[PDB]
Amino acid sequence: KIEEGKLVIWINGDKGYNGLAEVGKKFEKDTGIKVTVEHPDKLEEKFPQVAATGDGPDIIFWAHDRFGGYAQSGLLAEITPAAAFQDKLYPFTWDAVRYNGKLIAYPIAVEALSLIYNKDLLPNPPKTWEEIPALDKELKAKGKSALMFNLQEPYFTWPLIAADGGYAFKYAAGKYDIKDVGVDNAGAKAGLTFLVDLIKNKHMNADTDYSIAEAAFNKGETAMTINGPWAWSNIDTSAVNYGVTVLPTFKGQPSKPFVGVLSAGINAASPNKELAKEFLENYLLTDEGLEAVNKDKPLGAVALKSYEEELAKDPRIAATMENAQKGEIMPNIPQMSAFWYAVRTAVINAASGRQTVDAALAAAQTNAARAAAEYKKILLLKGFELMDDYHFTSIKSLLAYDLGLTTKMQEEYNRIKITDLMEKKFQGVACLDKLIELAKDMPSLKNLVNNLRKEKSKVA
Ligand SMILES: OC[C@H]1O[C@H](O[C@H]2[C@H](O)[C@@H](O)[C@@H](O)O[C@@H]2CO)[C@H](O)[C@@H](O)[C@@H]1O
């Protein structure tokens, strides 16, 4: 249960959660309603799990691309801002938080990656990706390096993958086509090949994550990084005179970041929906409320018109918007999760040498476009729901290592949860092949396996 009479808020650890709590303490002062701001790890994954059982926070913050999956699962309340309030934010930020005709979150700020560069190490930052290897050789001779950014999250490597023509889902006739994915076309391959060549030539290292990259740039050890507005604050505290500018071009085309709109959603199980609306609309989405958060960690280009007029004067914000206008606003469709997981696997495997570029993106393509619900439906109705409780717990014990099933998970997870985890580890037809292989030599399920063999040909 969620505690009535107060507000719990989840926001990512890289945003200004202390400034957000200052706005919460003003809310407590004015109303008597305690606001608790928390930043748990993997919150975009933790929320769907806890919210699917009526738990979790009253308000969740994340970029808009996750919210369509949350809304489709019924985890959010439809927000209804009055006409007068909607006029206070830019029309396109409302578009980012609209799903199935319903507004499903409050838009807060627009984020786009930019190139951040140390002006003392590099007064003329490169215009092209192609010239960076030469810059790195010259900089390594001084004991520095040219560029370090997070290679563990595909968000940061996407601008280069999209540059020569890679894309997520085709936008066709007013809607996203979930079957037309562009992650293994010629442009996506060319971009990822360049990234792997940057690593193979020891200009970057496959192990670099967010913490390593940020520490490297803020200690003056690398000349450039790739990050968004939240990261400016820590560079201000460090002794690095930095600039924020346009991402380098690749093969003469601009880098195309996926643009995210930081948004706040209201848990459908929250008993404090009216309080949540009051806090977001009249304490956060004000010049005073946004200023408290922005001073902690820069939000980017805020959705609130009156306050963005002041922030648009900042050159770092003009750079953020210039990069954004070369990319696109992320889709919010529920398939975006499967897209991000698939691209993450491709970038990591290619960057490490596990798979060739062509192998990694081919797998990411088919995984992103796969008919996940179709196979889950077969796995559940024609597989798990046709075996008894004794055989179900036996199968879960066989799957323990593969699905990361603790002892408690093996006792409590039901067939729907196991079906979801299984198809995510064994994508598409492979999850039917894994159950057939697992239930092969169980004489009681010979009939079950018999149909799964036919229903996997029937679906094909
Ligand atoms: O890399 C996958 C990841 O990309 C985006 O996440 C961004 C987020 O929008 C930024 O605000 C910041 O926190 O960096 C994140 C990447 O680490 C998507 O929003 C997210 O759904 C996706 O998993």
Residue numbers in the entry: 1 to 460
Show me the paper's own sentences about this structure.
MBP is one of the most commonly used protein expression tags due to its exceptional performance in enhancing the solubility of the target proteins. The death domain superfamily is a structural motif found in many proteins that are involved in physiological, as well as pathological processes. To explore broader crystallization space, we designed a series of protein expression vectors V28E1-V28E6 containing helical linkers of different lengths.
Indeed, both hNLRP12-PYD and hMNDA-PYD, two targets that failed to crystallize using fusion proteins expressed with the V28E vector, crystallized using fusion proteins expressed with these new vectors (V28E1-V28E6). Remarkably, we were able to crystallize and solve their structures using MBP-fusion proteins expressed with more than one vector. Similar to the hNLRP12-PYD, the human MNDA PYD domain was crystallized as MBP fusion proteins using three different protein expression vectors V28E3, V28E4, and V28E6. All of these fusion protein crystals diffract very well which led to their structure determination. Structural analysis shows that the designed “helical” linkers are slightly distorted probably attributed to crystal packing. Nonetheless, the target protein structures from all three different crystals are essentially identical with an rmsd of 0.30–0.40 Å, demonstrating again that the MBP fusion strategy enhances the crystallizability without alteration of the structural features of the target proteins. Structures of the hNLRP12-PYD and hMNDA-PYD determined with different linker sequences in different crystal lattices show no significant perturbation of the PYD structures.
